[PDB]
């Protein structure tokens, strides 16, 4: 920058001179954030819709893997970097911060789900760099693994990437209209990530692609889902790039994708980042100002020292009490997380109980041996959709809790550094959700049911046989549902522990910072009473000089509104 970065540098210099290492680090993080913002755009959709090819054609770089049956098996984040680099994001137990493990940039195009460096631990995602001018602005794309197919996770598993995302591109090729799972996922996704667009891919392959697009637009409007649809051909885009052909690039309609990313993602988020760094600059300056103006008050107004110091002492004590387990904001957080953990599990099992009841009715209303595949498919879809709805519900409740904790902290004045009256930078935990082992892998009928070797010399009456087969199917359904509830509940629990950790770290950092700034102000006010009058004006002038420089930073920051 000219202005903003200078302002950060300028403020950091003042903080360094005042031995405020905490402020220096805070400003270091803020500056790093505005350079590498990581504005994440999740590329979602079912398998083989053209997600990876879209990403490759866009950046004109083969970071994604594209094959006719294989390719993406792990969530992959692509961000800007002049030099190629890559790392695994490997999970730690009990919602602890994930571990970054450097790998050679190649290993990507391999199955990294069992990368040797991970030591059998869960790989949440892969984060790779690419030197694409497109990413220069701070856009980061998340390619998603194949879902919706046999042996794969359900499309709703993609929802786990969205709480930490700023935008979503929903990929569906123009071979046919939206399926019901696609429609359900879109509705769920918009609850978490409102900024989204449909990319209707492979227009070069399907002559009637416009028919599908218009039918999809109609369907979206009937469902009350406000998402734009953008037609595109990655294939045309790729030739356009090769030929440096502006006209062919227009035909691929990729500029429309660029336009959406620019006007609804990059520009919008750049504004929010701009606001936060300006706020970071202002806060740092105001923390420094408190000690300066407190010492000034002690000088210019000696008869007010008792009230000034008593106030500063009071606020310091409150800031210190805020670091104790008994602090109200921490109580609200801890009790809130505990309640939500139980409530999320209660919600899930309620949804599952309703689903199990429906499936059992279906089983009792037919011949299960004539519908085992159809019954299994419906159950898996219903369960996976419920997991998705549960995840959305949990996200909304977690957001509400974080808001309440924020209010509790602020209303306690634990971030206030105004003069008394006188006269997350860590590794994120986002990844694919987990429900069942894979689609089409549950069968209500088990192997050793003995239908061939169960026949006696004499025939079983049908009534009993139906009853037995139906009871067997019900048993397997209830076990499947219970097993999923166990696995999902575990992920929910660890997720909330992670959120708890992130929020706790955040506010303890603020409390320590406030404690420090108040204690410096306190010492400054005390040390001023020790100087004889002969050195008053000399120190005072220096303070007024410091005061002006800091107020200049605040004002400069304010104008950058
Ligand atoms: N004609 C045409 N074919 C495309 C286009 N985009 C992708 N394909 C083909 O469609 C298939 C799917 O490509 P991918 O980009 O790997 O799709 P995907 O969603 O990433 O697949 P998964 O990662 O397994 O979920 C590939 O074999 C491509 O050759 C396109 O724009 N036009
Ligand atoms: Mg792919």
Residue numbers in the entry: -1 to 421, 457 to 594
From the manuscript:
A 2.2 Å resolution structure was determined by the single-wavelength anomalous diffraction (SAD) method. Four signature motifs wrap around GTP: G1 (P-loop), G2 (switch 1), G3 (switch 2), and G4. As expected, K49 and S50 in the G1, T70 in G2, and D141 in G3, with the help of a magnesium ion, coordinate the binding of the phosphate moieties in the nucleotide. K200 and D202 in G4 engage the ribose. Furthermore, the G2 of IniA forms a U-shaped flap on top of GTP, likely stabilizing the positions of several key residues in the catalytic core. Analyzing the lipid-binding mode, we found a tartaric acid (TA) molecule (from the crystallization buffer) bound next to the predicted TM region.
IniA consists of an N-terminal GTPase domain and two HBs. Here, we determined structures of IniA, with and without bound GTP, and demonstrated that it mediates membrane fission in vitro. Our results suggested that IniA, like other BDLPs, has weak GTPase activity and nucleotide-dependent dimerization in solution, but tends to form nucleotide-independent homotypic interactions on the membrane and cuts the membrane.
